[PDB]
Every structure is written in structure tokens, then in C-alpha cells.
Amino acid sequence: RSMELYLDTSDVVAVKALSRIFPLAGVTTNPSTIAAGKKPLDVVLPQLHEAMGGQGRLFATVMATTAEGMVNDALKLRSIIADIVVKVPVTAEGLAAIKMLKAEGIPTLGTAVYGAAQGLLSALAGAEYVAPYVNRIDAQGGSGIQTVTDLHQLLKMHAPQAKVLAASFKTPRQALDCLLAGCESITLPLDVAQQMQSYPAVDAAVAKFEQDWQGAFGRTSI
Amino acid sequence: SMELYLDTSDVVAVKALSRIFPLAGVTTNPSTIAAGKKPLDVVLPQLHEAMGGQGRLFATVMATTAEGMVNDALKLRSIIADIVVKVPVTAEGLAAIKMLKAEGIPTLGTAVYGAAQGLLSALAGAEYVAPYVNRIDAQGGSGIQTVTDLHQLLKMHAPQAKVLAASFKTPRQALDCLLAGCESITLPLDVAQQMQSYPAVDAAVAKFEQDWQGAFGRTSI
Amino acid sequence: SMELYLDTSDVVAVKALSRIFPLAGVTTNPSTIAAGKKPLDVVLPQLHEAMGGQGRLFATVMATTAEGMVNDALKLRSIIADIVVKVPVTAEGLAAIKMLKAEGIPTLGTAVYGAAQGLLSALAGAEYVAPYVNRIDAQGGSGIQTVTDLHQLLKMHAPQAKVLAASFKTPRQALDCLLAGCESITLPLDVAQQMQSYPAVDAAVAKFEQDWQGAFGRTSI
Amino acid sequence: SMELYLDTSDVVAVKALSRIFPLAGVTTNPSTIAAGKKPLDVVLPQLHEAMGGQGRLFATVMATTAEGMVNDALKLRSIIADIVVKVPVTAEGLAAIKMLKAEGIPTLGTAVYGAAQGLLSALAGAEYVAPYVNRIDAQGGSGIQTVTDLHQLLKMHAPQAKVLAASFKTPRQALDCLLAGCESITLPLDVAQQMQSYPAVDAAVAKFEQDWQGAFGRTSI
Amino acid sequence: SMELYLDTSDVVAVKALSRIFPLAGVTTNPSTIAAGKKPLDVVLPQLHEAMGGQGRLFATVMATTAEGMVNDALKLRSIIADIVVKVPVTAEGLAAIKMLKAEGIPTLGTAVYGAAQGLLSALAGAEYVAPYVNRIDAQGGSGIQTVTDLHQLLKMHAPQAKVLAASFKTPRQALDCLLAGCESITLPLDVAQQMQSYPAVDAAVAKFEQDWQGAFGRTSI
Amino acid sequence: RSMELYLDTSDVVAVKALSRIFPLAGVTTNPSTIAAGKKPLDVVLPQLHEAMGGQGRLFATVMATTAEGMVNDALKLRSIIADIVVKVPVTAEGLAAIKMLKAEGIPTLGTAVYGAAQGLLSALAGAEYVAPYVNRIDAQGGSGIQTVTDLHQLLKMHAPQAKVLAASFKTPRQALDCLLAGCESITLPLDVAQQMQSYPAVDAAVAKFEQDWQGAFGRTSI
Amino acid sequence: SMELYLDTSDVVAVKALSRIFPLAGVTTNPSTIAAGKKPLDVVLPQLHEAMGGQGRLFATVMATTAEGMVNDALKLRSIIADIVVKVPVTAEGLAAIKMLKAEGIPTLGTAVYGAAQGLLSALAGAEYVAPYVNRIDAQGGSGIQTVTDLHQLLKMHAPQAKVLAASFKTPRQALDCLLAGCESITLPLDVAQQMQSYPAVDAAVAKFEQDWQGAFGRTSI
Amino acid sequence: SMELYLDTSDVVAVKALSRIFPLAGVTTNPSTIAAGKKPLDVVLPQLHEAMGGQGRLFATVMATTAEGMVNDALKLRSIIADIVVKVPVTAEGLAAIKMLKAEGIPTLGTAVYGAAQGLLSALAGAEYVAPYVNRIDAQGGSGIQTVTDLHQLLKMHAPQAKVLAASFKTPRQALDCLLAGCESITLPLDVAQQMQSYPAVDAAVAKFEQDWQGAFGRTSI
Ligand SMILES: CC(=O)[C@@H](O)[C@H](O)c1cccs1
Ligand SMILES: CC(=O)[C@@H](O)[C@H](O)c1cccs1
Ligand SMILES: CC(=O)[C@@H](O)[C@H](O)c1cccs1
Ligand SMILES: CC(=O)[C@@H](O)[C@H](O)c1cccs1
Ligand SMILES: CC(=O)[C@@H](O)[C@H](O)c1cccs1
Ligand SMILES: CC(=O)[C@@H](O)[C@H](O)c1cccs1
Ligand SMILES: CC(=O)[C@@H](O)[C@H](O)c1cccs1
Ligand SMILES: [Cl-]
Ligand SMILES: [Cl-]
Ligand SMILES: [Cl-]
Q1: How far apart, in whole angstroms, are the C-alpha atoms of residue D97 and residue B71?
Q2: Which CATH class is domain A1-222?
Q3: Do H135 and H165 touch, CB atoms closer than 8 A?
Q4: How many angstroms separate the CA atoms of F130 and F123, rounded?
Q5: Burial label, A103 (beta-carbon count in 10 A; 0-12, 13-18, 19+)
Q6: Cβ(F221)–Cβ(G63) under 8 Å?
Q7: Which of G151, G175, E135, G199 minimizes the C-alpha distance to H119?
Q8: A touches C, CB cut-off 8 Å, minimum 3 pairs
Q9: Which of A22, D63, H51, H174 could crosslink H55 through cysteines, CB 3.0-4.6 Å?
Q10: Residue D59: which H helix or E strand, with range?
Q11: CA C187, CA C10: separation in Å to the nearest integer?
Q12: Which residues are bridge partners to B164 per DSSP?
């Protein structure tokens, strides 16, 4: 029943480096980070999978406007990565697509979720993950944390096969607050993930350990 | 696990929104049947087909004695074999719900304006109870508090029944009902159709498209 | 799952309301049987018949010593094989409830005015505990608070017992007991006949009939 | 499910109240043993007999060292084979409790003035933990708060142990302890009597009788 | 259920307190080893023996790089076969914890100053997470809040991990961690030595003795 | 706006002894304790007044059963003690009496109060103090603390010229809980007051002060 | 605005810390006076001048009878004319506080272990009430809860008095008292020192200096 | 009534954002002054001019000793006669704040990482206390909690002082500080720039424009 922690990036190098340190469940991509990488899906998706040692889940986003075109995008994505999770923006056509994909047996995530009812609808349609945009919700004068709180309650009561996968972070604290509200998965962008490697108090505590050790013995080693 | 219903008799709307929303069914009442100009024997099968043969239908008895309500219920079931029969929760309605429980015909208790009235309908055997959220507000109560209390009462005192909240003017009313734990909900057309547009979602998707076009010169996968 | 009871000895009213309400049985007390002016050997089979041979019956012992109360319990059980014996929660009553649990005759602890007294009766073996909600109010206490505390005590510390709340002047009191978790209830006649009319529900049904008429020329299905 | 105890060494009171209260046993302590002037080998079997040969008994060790306390335990168990041994929660007492757990002799941690101390006694092996509610109050703290915390600590961190609350001046202290989840309790005689007999219950039974003799000219059933 | 630990490497003190406290084991850290002036291969078997061969031991790695930390873990395990390896939760420590999870060596994430950092160590595979309660308090934050948050985060998002709170100045800090749900705890010597004597307890036992000798001439049973 | 602590007794020697220790505002008598004292009102009441050194408020209960009889009793009590406060049990006739005595300008207390509504009624009729029987309410299965809480709120919102004067106590904790609920005055029975009279922990702290002082100066005193 | 005190009789420390800390004065007690090994007539003026003639002084009576406590108050006030006299809140101390109020000498009620005790000392006339926060904890209670209740009691029932919390092992205890509304406080030396230096502050000041140096080739102006 | 500040040394940005926002002034620190590459004597009057010659300026001392910081403050006040001097809340900074209050120079206590530290700075005389919200988050605490506690501490215990919260990554952090009561705030450039873009507002206005055009054939008044 462990939580799932994802990297929100398309940057293969960073995924390889951070995979060594973090207990990562996989990588979420979106069209903007794919485009930023400049490499097409059929190139970058296997590269990201390789960068995680072949383990973990990948997510990528459909691009078509109509529900049926979104199903065709899903089929292409799955032909690139057989067990990829298909992200579908939760519009009306997106809801139709999510229902179609549930009928086809292809796992989906409802993305670009700005409110709890919209998120719950995508889960009822069949999405196994629902991704509210926490920081984006804030920026249009709402509360991303409250949306995550409500959405998580609604999924657990009314669509219990789905999880919240919160996205859109500017600080580690936002992600902490989402987890404290029960949200069962999370995808962190690169800078937020990197702010979680510091803690100078830990460094000083290890330094005092070493000073005491090299002071009773003649060693910093064991 | 929750059941989302559409509160209409408009067969065109049912077919359109069946494509978008995860509908569990359609609830009719006398007023939307009438406004549809079509008799039960025509529009009930049209509704059933408009959601692709899956889905639950609900329709309201019209008689005013309990035995008359049982008669109405039998006619409705002969029109649609698995239909759920809405009985307004009056004294006679409670009698009808009791008799129909005996008959093995599933019932919903409708026109509920208060938590205890709703619980009674559930105790008599209704497997759904439908408080009128917005109408409760309109006589100076709180439809949300009635749904909250009714849900608690059903979950500990009549656990076979669900709240099926109805009567909404805004999507937020329905969201508040769901947050209070209400297990099913039926939405009128304009509320469901407000749950379709999201400007910020379209702006994010348009930005995705623009970035994709800047990098790959295309708009497609 | 909840048990709804009628608190009366009036046989004609039990007959009348057993068709409408979903009754689990009837509770009598000394004052109620004395208003009836028919002895326990008459009115108890009549009350049993007026519920269609269904539903449970409750009646109160009159003796003052535990051994006397046990004798009364055997009398009542000889009149109605499956009757539940009401015992006022005094010291002797507590002793009698213990004795009756040893005998295997189900009891209810009645005339409870405080949570601790009620819990003691449940621990003695009573299956139901009956606080007098309104009478507690009149002592300057809070019937609702006592019911709330008693239900928590039973669920934590005597889980084989249920609160069967009694003594009501308004439907709201009974609803408040049910929302506090109280698992059964017995209503006096007037409070039963205040939950059986709602002008808003009749107006709703009337508007439904008006639309049906204005669209099909009939008020029938 | 809850265990109610009497906090006394008075064999007459035990006989008389075991007929009325659903007692699970009797708790003795050195002061009440002394006040009875009878040694343990006399008064413990008297107490066991006054409970009708059922019931759990508790007695306190008197030794000051762990190993002496273990010897006191063995003495106590020779007097009453299934007695629970009360050990004051001092450092030596914690030692004794661990030893007695190894020996298979059920203990109770007594003279508990704080929640951490009580949890320690339960972790060492005590199956009951006995905070002194009123004494804690008298020292400037809150006995109810200590019972509340200790019960939470036991259910999370030593789930084989129960709180057995002791030291009471009013029935309300006992009730507050039970509402806080306390699974067992032991009452001193005066509090136990205040829990029997309430004038409003007697007035209610008297009015029941009086109008049972108004219609019907009788006293009985 | 709960696991109580001593935070020390003083072998004599461990042998002494293991007779009184219900210890689950001993945690060491590099400062406390150094202050003991004995190397690991000497003092770890000594602490194990001083606990009587039962009990879990914990010891900290010294390397700065993840691979060297894995090395230290193997060495520690050669000294004590079932020892838990404490890894400070840095980036390299997180790497070391993931590697050690792959190796099947149980780990504790130590030097934890915030809830998210601790949660990460559990996700990487640590079975225990040790926030420094008082050191968080000293830097202006709240060690109790960090423990409260961390416990919730582990119970819902990393359920195979427990909080093992460390760094205490008062018994009240440890109590508050346990009231927050903390499933294990490691106490420094002075703090363990302060929940070891209670004046009001000794006064109660002396009152017992006084009454007992006023009645039976003697003390002892 | 200091609270008022009263002693609930008519034992003159206990009043003199306990007034030395405690900051008493006065003494409340009732018929039972006056009877226990075996001395008529015209002799105990002046004795109690002097046992408080002349300062201090006195309270005594009427014995008559009709409103006009109670006004008579009140006039007699005021002839004994010019500024005595007249206690009136809150019955229907008691309420009529309190209205009449308000008209007379004679301060009154509504006593034998078992419910918040009853107590508020007595204050509305003109009582300046209202005395719920905390422990008697606890005794018959209710909550004297809740009754004090509700009564205090009612008086502050709806009868602000009146104060709660809580009575009937088996423990000091009941009294502290009344005070924490805002109750503005309290009358303590002898045993409860006497339990508020020693604390071993304080004596241990003082003994340790003395022992450190002796170790440093060999003196024990200043 | 708040009064922050130092809880010491170390003259050198008082002079040092008075330069850093915004102190309103110094509280002495018999233990710290004795540890300084100088009598009152010597050390009190030394402390006064170590605060630069500003600041209030507090000192404790030694006598055990009320008359003796008053006599001690007179000696104390002849040494320091505006000193506040600390009286331990015993029965005799309550008497002494009453007498000193009648004399017009300001008092603090010390060694308060419970909220009602503290309230009594304020009612008797004490301008300050000093609970022993950490010592209340060590007895198994909660010093923080005592301070909270006492502050509420003083504000509604003895408004001329302030809580002056004392007895601290951590700065967090002090902070929790101030958050509870505590209007004055007195810190021992080690807690006082912990409250000034924070490594993260120094790190931020160093980063500021480094940026300045990089942009201007200096660390000044 | 609340005071909104811009946290920058960028003279151009100050002029731009002065046009939009209701600024009360500008806070500088060493890092932003340094990043601007202009000495205090040059950039501080530039900033004053960019604010239209009104509003408050803040600048930080660089010295490490109280006496050094005081002379730094004198230099600052010679550049800007009414400037507020930011002093990092260390021990030396505390002494500096006390001395500067003696000198009548307004100060702000900066680099506050905990509520107690900040309160000390206000008690020493600082008119403003600046916790570093985001930096507190970063080291494992909660900057929002620190702001909340500090604001309560200042309002109860140092009412002449205001929280001036700083260090922000999002507008939400600042909103949460204001909702906790914090009375002043200083925003970095990018957060201030997120607070001037509102897509839904632009959409509503464009809809206004379109309706006005469809009715009057023009877009203006
Ligand atoms: C039973 C219902 O569905 C009603 O809510 C109907 O939709 C309304 C018309 C005007 C207010 S409510
Ligand atoms: C237990 C009952 O059946 C109620 O009728 C109750 O006994 C009354 C309250 C007020 C008058 S009678
Ligand atoms: C632990 C007990 O058994 C109680 O009886 C308690 O110790 C008291 C006796 C008298 C005043 S408090
Ligand atoms: C080394 C640690 O992690 C702590 O266990 C240690 O006990 C403390 C040092 C300063 C305050 S507490
Ligand atoms: C009327 C009073 O003033 C009370 O003292 C009353 O007499 C009590 C009975 C039991 C405890 S208190
Ligand atoms: C009056 C005092 O300051 C003492 O209570 C001192 O502060 C101590 C606290 C804990 C052990 S000694
Ligand atoms: C002290 C300040 O004025 C802030 O700029 C603070 O230093 C930071 C927040 C995020 C990165 S640095
Ligand atoms: Cl049966
Ligand atoms: Cl050690
Ligand atoms: Cl008396």
C-alpha cells in the first residue's frame, strides 16, 4: 500500500541521475516537457524507460482533439510503450475518450484537473489516476491543496479504484501538504525534487559524529 | 462506485450526454415526461435505447391511493422490466412502498423534504431516497444539511438504501452532496452541461499544442 | 436495520398505522394499558393480531421485588411467547434483569433517566435500554445528551444492547436521537401522526398532476 | 464486555451488592484489608464466597523489593488460585511485573499517577493498569485526562492491557472515565450506592402503579 | 506491541536498566560509541550480552558515499548478525538505503529533521525513521509536529515503516510522541531515569504499610 | 472584576478558622446548616458577621412557602443583618417572591436551581445571584458542570445583572470546572475548602529550598 | 507588553546576558541564592547593579508560618526597597499573602503545581502566580495545561494578577507557555542561551557577506 | 492598513511595479544590493526616487558586533534619514536592537527562523520582525506555522511590533500569511509579477466588451 513518487520531466539525463538517489515509481511526461526535450515520443519514451533501468511506469499525453482521435493517440502511445499510462485532459471529449479507453482496457490518467468534481468525473469515466494541477489552481485564485483534499475524499468514497496523482508544484511544502491530505501519488518537477537533497543540519550532525569518532579513535572509517 | 444519473426525459440530450458522462441511468418525473409530449410507452424505450441498452431508468407513479400506486408500478414494469418505481413519500406513498417491497419491485422514495421522511421511505423498503436539495433550500431549510443527515441515517439505520439526491441549480450543490457522502445523484440538463466547459483546461491544452508545434512542426502524435 | 416502534396500547390505532408505517412492534407501559382499561391477557393478543401477527411486543412488570418481577415476567411470557419484558431500572429491577438473563427471557431496562443507570441495566443483561428523553428534559437535564452518552456507552461497553429511546413530544426529538446513533425508538401516537403530512410533498404531487394533465388530458398512467 | 468491580474488602457489602450490580469481581487494597481487621487467608475466601464463587479478585503485594513482591504474589495465589496481583508501579514494581509475566501470574499495575508510568506497567506485562482518578485530581492534575491519555496509549501501544480506573468521589467521575473509553472500573461503596436509587425513577414507577390502580382496582399483574 | 529502546552505549547501564524497564533493545550512534571509547566489534557484542541475548541493536554507518555505507553495513552485520543499520538521510544515504533494501539488510533512516525527508527514507526502504525531536525543537520548529506528521505519512504512504523517535530532554516529549501514535521510541539515560521514581506513589505505599501495621502489627503479607 | 469565594457553612468557629487562611468574600447559610448549628438566626447571623471581621457578605434562606410569607421572612432577615442577601428557592411562589423583593429593593439569590432555564428565570425576576446545585445534578445522572456552563452563558447574554453562585460540591475539581466555565462566584463546603489546604509537592519543594540553604549557610532562616 | 525574567543568582551571568537580552528583571530562589554562596544582603544589591539599576527583583521567604513569612518580607524589602516577595502557596503562605496585601508589599505566589492553588494565591492578593511547569510535568501532569487553565482563571476571576511561568528544561516549553497567553516568564540560564543562537541564521548572514564580498570586494559599510 | 512591500534592489522594477501595486515601500538585503552592483550610497536614494519620494526603505547592517551594527545603522541613516535598519536576530543583533532603540532608530529583526527568536527581537525594540517563510519550509519546518505563532506572540506580548513576512516562492504563501493575521509583507519580483495576471478576468472583460459592441456598435463609453 506504498505511495508512488514520480518525476515530472522528459529530461533523460536528470532521470538517470535522480533515479540513483530517489525511490521513484516512474516518470510523467506532458507535451511541453516532451517538446522541450526536442526528441519525438518514439525516441524519448524508450530512453526514459532505460534511464529508470527498465522499471517503473511511464505516462504520456494524447494530442488529438476528438475522443476517437484521442483513442488513436492512445493506441500509438501503447505501441511505443506497451504498459504506458495514457494521460487525457479532462474535457468533454476527454471524458468520452476515457470511457472508450476503459472499454479498450488501456489505463488512463485524467490530467489538467482544476476542480474536484471534474477530477471525480474522470475517475468515474475510468481513469486510474487523476492529476489536479495544484500550483495552477492556486494561481487562478483557488486552493490547490483544498482541491486535492476534496478530490481525494471523493475518490475514496465514490471511485475507489482511482488515486490522486498531484502535479504542478513550486515548493516541496505543497507536495508535503498534498500527501498529508491523503493523496496517494505525486509527480515532482526537477527543481522541487532537487530542493529535497539539502538539509545542512543533517550535514552538521554527520560532521559532529565524525569529530567524536575521530577523537575517540584514529579514524573516520568504521 | 457512485452512480451518476441524468434528470431528464429529453432523449436527444440523453444520447448526447451518454457519450460524455459516465451515466448509470436516467431519472424521469411527471413534469419532464409531460414537457416531452410523449407517453411513457414511447419515451421510456427511447430513453433506454438512447443510453445504448445499458443503464437504469426511473419513473414516478401518478395514482394517489397505495393500491393505485401498485397498479401504476406494474404498468411501468411492463413497459420497462428493470425500471425503478419512484413513489412520493406520503402516508399513502409509504403504504405503496411497503406493498411494493412485498412484490419484489425496487422503489425510490421521491419528493423528500426532510431527513426523517426520507428514512421512513427507506425503512418501508425503498432502495433509493431522493431529497429535493434546491427545493428544500427554497422553503428556508438547507438541502445540503438534509442530504448530510439523511445519508448518516441511511448508513446506520437503513443500510440497504442510498441517497439519490436531486433538484440542483448549480454543480457546486451536487459536489457538496457528494462530499457529504451521498452515494448517487441525478443532474438536470443545464447543471450537467455546466460540467462540460472549462476555459483553463482548454488554455492548457492550447499551450500544449503550441509548444508541440514549436518543437516538431506538427500538431499530432 | 433500525427498529421503529409504536408507543401505545390503542389497538385500533395500531391497526390503522400498521399499513402506513414500517413498524417493528409495539411498546406498552402501565399508564398506557391502564388508559386502555383492558387486562394484559386481552389486549396483548389483540395488539399482536393488529400487527398481522408480525412485530414484537413489550410490556412492563408491576412487582416491587426482584422475585416478584421475575414472576410477572413469567406471566407475560405465558401470554405472549416471544414478548420482551420491560423492567424499571431500580436496584430491585437490576436484580430482576440479572435473574431474567439467567432464565433466558429478554428484557428492556425502562425509566432510564441517566446514562450510567442505563449502562448498568445493559450490563445486567437487558437487550434494550429506554431513556425517557422528554422526561429527562423536564428534570432540567438533556434527553438528547443522555441518549448520546448512553449509545456510546452501550457500543463500547455493552455491545449486545441497543438504546430504545422513548418519551417524545416532537418528531425532531426522535430524529435527534436517531442522528446520535440510537438504534431503535418508540413513538407516541401524535408524534407518529405528525410525520404523516407534508404540505410541500402534496404541492409537489399536485404540480406533477397539473403538468401531466396539461400534456395528456389525464391524471393517470 | 466491560468489567465493573467493587473497591472494598467489606464482605457484607459485597454479598448485598452482588445481588443488584452486574459485578465482575472485587478489588482489595491494603487499607481496606486493614479496615476489615481480618487477614488475607480469611477475608479473601469470604470475598470469593460472597460473590457466589464467580468473580475476579485482586490483592496488593506488600513487599518493598521485586523478589519479595514475587513471593507475595505466590502467597496470594496460594490463597486464591486465579487472583490478579496488584503491584504498585515503582521501579521495583516494574521489575516485579516483568518477573511475574515470566511466571504466568496476571498482574495489575496500581498506584498509577501518570499516563507514561501506566503504559510502562502495561509494557512490562500488566494486564490491567489502575490510575487513581481522584488522587490525581487532588494533586493538581486531571484524573480524567490521565485516564483518557492512558487508554489511548494502551490501545495503540500495549493492546493486551486494559485501564481499570480506581479512586472515585462521585458517579460522574466514573461515567466520564467510561465515556473516555476506559474498559474496566472499580467503585468504592458510597459511589456504588449513589448509582442505585434515583427519586425520579421511583416517582415514575409510583405513577405507573397509581393509575394502574385507577383503571383496574389492583396492585399487581 | 510498542518497542521501547535505550539510546546509549554504556554496557553497565544497559544491564542495570534491562532489569527494570521493558526494553526492546538499544540504539547506538557514533557519538555515544566514541564516548564509550570501545570499538564496535567490542561494545556491540557486549551490549547484546548485557540485554541477555534478546533485544535488537542499532548502529550507524560512517562512510560518506553510498557504496561505502553499504560496506559499513556489511561489516556491522558481521559483528551482529541481526543488527539494524542506521543511515543518515542524505542524498547518498537515500541511495545507500535503496541499495541496502536490495541487499536484504534492514535499515533505519536517522538524523531526520522534517517529515518529508523521513518519508523519503521509508520509501527508499528503511523499516524505521528516527526524527530528532528535541533537536528540531532547538532549531525553532516543533519536533512533536514533525513526529505527528511523519507518523501519519508513514501509516498511509509507507506502511512497512515505523517512527522510532529520538532526541529527548524530558519524559513529556516522549509521552507526546507516543500520544501522537509513534510506534517506537529510544530514550537517553537521564530521561529513562526520570520516569523511574514518583513521590506520590511512595507516599501511597507508605500509607498502605501504615494502615497494614495498625491492623496486623507487621508489614509483609 | 474579581471572583467571589464563599464558605458554605454556619459553623462560626470554622468560619473564623478558615477566614484566616482563605480570601473569603462571605458565608452562605441554608436552613439545614443553621439547624445543625442549633442556634437561631438572631444569634448565629451576628456571630457569623463578626467571625468574618465585619467585612463580608451573608446569605440566608427564607422558610415560608407563599410569596408574601417569603417577603415577610426577608424583612426579618434584613432586620437582623441590614445587608444580608435573601436566598429564595426557585419555585413558582419563589419567583413571585423574587419579583416582590426586587420591587422592595432587597437583594436576593435564587437557590435550589437544578436547570439552566429555572435559574435564568430567577435572575429575570430580579435575583442578583443564581445557585445551581452542581453535585445534586451530577448525583441524579445529569451534569452540574454543563448546567453551570449553560446558566452562566444565559446570565451573561440575557440577565447581565446576575451572577452564578455555584454550590453543592463533593470535590474541588467540580468547583475548578465551574470556575473554568466562567462561573463568577462559588460557595465551598467545609471539607472541600479543607482539601484545598495542603499539597505535598509544595512542602517537598520548600524542604529542598531549606536543605540547600542549610548546606550553603547552615541557617535554615533569613 | 510582556516581562521576561532571568531565573538565576549568578551575578556575572546576569551582567553578561543583560547586554543581549531584553530583561525586565531577575527572579532568585533559595536554591540559586545558596548556590551563589552569598547572603541576601550581599547578592541582591549585586544583582540590582548587574542589571544597571533597572529591572525588578524577586526573592523567596524562608519562614514556614504566615507571621514569619511576613517578617521575611520585611527583611527582604529593607535590602531591596521595591523587591517582589515570593511566597510558596501553602495554607500559611495564603495567609501571608493576605497579610502582605494588607501591608502593600507586592507578592508572587510560588511553587504552584495546580491551577486552583494558583488562583487562590491571586485571590489572596498576589500580583504574580508562578507554576513550576517542568516540575508539574515530572509528576505526570501537564505543566502546559496548568499554565493554560491558570491564565484563563486569572483573566476572568483575578484580573490584577499575571502568570509568571517558571521551571523549564527546553525553550519549547517556554514558547508553549507564551502561546498559551502567559504574560511573564522566567528562564534559567541554559534555556536562555539556547534561545539566542541558531546556525541557520549564521549561515544566512554568511551567505549575505559572501554575496556582498563578491559584488564589492569587502564585507563592511 | 496592512503594509505591502517589494523585496528588491532593482530600481527599474520598483518604478514599474510602483505604477500597479499599492506599495508601502521597499526592503533591500545584502544579496539583492550585491546583485545590483551599486553601493548603498548610490542605490538607496535611487530607490527612494523610484518610489516617488514617499514610502519606507529598509536596509541591512553588515557588521558582526553590536557596536559595529550600531555604527552601520548610523551610516544607513545618513544616506536615508528615515530608513528602517534591518538587524539579523542573533545575540549581537539583539544587543544592537536594544542599543538602537536607545538611539531612537527604528529597526527590523531579520533572518528570523522561529517564533521565540522573533519575539525576542520585538521585545528588544524592533518595530518589525521578518520571518523567512520559504526558508523555514526548506529546513523542514512550516513557515506558515511560524508566522502564525509569531503574530500571536507579538499581539499578546509585544504589541508595538508587526510581523513583516519575507522569503516567498508563491502568492499563496503570502496569502496564507495574511490570513494568519500577519500585518505586513514583502514580495520578491516574480511573486509580485504573478500577482498581476488574471486570465478569467480578461475573459470576463472581453465578454463585457463583446456585449457592449453587439448592442452599441462600439467598445467605449
Ligand atoms: C424534482 C426536480 O427535479 C426539481 O428540482 C425541478 O427541476 C425544479 C423546477 C424549479 C425549481 S427545481
Ligand atoms: C415514556 C412515555 O411514553 C412518554 O409518554 C413520557 O412518559 C411523558 C412525558 C410527558 C408526559 S408523559
Ligand atoms: C485507590 C483507591 O482504592 C481509592 O479508594 C483512593 O485511594 C482514595 C481513598 C480515600 C480518598 S481517595
Ligand atoms: C545525538 C542525538 O541525535 C540526540 O539523541 C542527543 O540526545 C542530543 C543532543 C542535543 C540535544 S539532544
Ligand atoms: C443545598 C446545599 O447547599 C448542598 O450543600 C447540598 O446539601 C448537598 C448534598 C450532597 C452534596 S452537597
Ligand atoms: C523554582 C525553579 O526554578 C525550579 O523548579 C527549577 O527550575 C527546576 C526544574 C526541574 C528540576 S529543578
Ligand atoms: C531574505 C529574502 O528576502 C528572500 O529573498 C529569501 O532569501 C529566499 C526565498 C527563496 C530563495 S531565497
Ligand atoms: Cl424470545
Ligand atoms: Cl551513553
Ligand atoms: Cl457546616
Answers
A1: 74
A2: alpha beta
A3: no
A4: 7
A5: exposed
A6: yes
A7: G175
A8: no
A9: H51
A10: strand D56-60
A11: 13
A12: B184
What nine digits make up the cell of F25?
468574600
Neighbours of chain G (3+ CB pairs under 8 A): A, D, E, F, H
d(C-alpha D114, C-alpha E201), whole Å: 10
Residue type, B94: L
**Contacts B203 to H, Cβ<8 Å:** 199
Q: Give the residue, by CA position, lying nearest to ligand 4 atom 10.
A: E135
**Through-space distance between the first and last CA atoms of chain H, rounded to whole angstroms:** 34
Q: In units of Å, what resolution does this entry have?
A: 2.2
DSSP for C105-123, written as a single string: --EEEEEE-SHHHHHHHHH
Contacts of C153 (CB under 8 A, 6+ apart): C115, C116, C118, C119, C122, D178, D179
8 A C-beta contact, residue C119 and residue D200: no
The most distant pair of C-alpha atoms in chain C lies apart, rounded to whole Å, by: 72
The neighbouring-strand residues paired with F6 are: F26, F187
Which helix (H) or strand (E) segment holds residue B158: the answer is: none
Q: Which three cell numbers stand for residue A164?
A: 490522486
Rg (CA), chain H: 20
Alpha carbons G71 and H188: distance in angstroms, whole number? 63
> Which stretches within chain B are classed as H helix?
11-20, 30-35, 40-50, 66-79, 91-103, 115-123, 133-138, 143-157, 171-179, 189-194, 199-216
Please report, for residues B72, B95, B126, H19, the alpha-carbon distance to residue B87 in angstroms, rounded to integers and kept in the order given: 10, 10, 9, 65
Burial G196-205, CB ≥16 within 10 A → b, else e: bebebbebbb
Residues with beta carbon inside 6 Å of ligand 2? C 7, 29, 132, 134-135, 166-167, 188
- The x, y and z cell numbers of residue A202, run together, are 543533517
What whole-number distance in Å separates Cα of residue F101 and Cα of residue B70? 69
Question: SS3 of A133, please?
Answer: strand
CB atoms within 10 A of CB H103: 14
C-alpha to C-alpha distance for D44 and H179, rounded to whole angstroms: 66
Ligand 5 pocket, residues with Cβ under 6 angstroms: F 8, 30, 133, 135-136, 167-168, 170, 189
Whole-number Å distance between alpha carbons of H178 and E41: 57
The H or E element containing residue G59 is: strand G56-60
Confirm if F122 and F107 have CB atoms less than 8 A apart.
no
Contact map slice: A 11-40 vs E, CB within 8 A: 20-23
Domain boundaries, given as residue ranges, for chain C:
1-221
- Residue in F with minimal Cα distance to C149: F142
Cell of H153: 506572540
Q: Which three cell numbers stand for residue D99?
A: 518477573
Do residues C164 and C129 lie in contact, with contact meaning Cβ atoms separated by under 8 Å?
A: yes
Neighbour-count burial for B22-49, b at 16+ CB within 10 Å, e otherwise: bbbbbbbbbbbbbebebebeebbeebbe
**CA F186 / ligand 5 centre spacing (Å):** 13
Exactly one of A16, A87, A102, A163 is catalytic; name it. Answer: A87
In terms of DSSP H, where are the helices of chain E?
Answer: 11-17, 30-36, 40-50, 66-79, 91-103, 115-124, 133-138, 143-157, 171-179, 189-192, 199-216
Q: Please report, for residues B178, C65, D2, E21, H11, the alpha-carbon distance to residue D51 in angstroms, rounded to integers and kept in the order given.
A: 55, 21, 18, 37, 91
Reduce the secondary structure of A143-195 to three states and give it as a string. CHHHHHHHHHHHHHHHCCCCEEEEECCCCHHHHHHHHHCCCCEEEECHHHHHH
Q: Is A16 a catalytic residue?
A: no
Residues linked to residue B166 through DSSP beta bridges, in sequence order: B132
- Residue H165's alpha-carbon distances to F155, H8, H17, H181, in angstroms, are 43, 14, 19, 11
Topology at the third CATH level for domain E1-221: TIM Barrel (3.20.20)
Contact in structure between C118 and C149 (CB atoms under 8 Å): no
Report the candidate in A196, A189, A198 with the shortest Cα–Cα distance to residue A6: A189
Contacts of F20 by beta carbon, 8 Å cutoff, 6+ apart? G95
Q: Which method, experimentally, gave rise to this model?
A: X-ray
Catalytic residues of E: 86
For residue C22, the CA-to-ligand 6 centroid distance in Å is 68
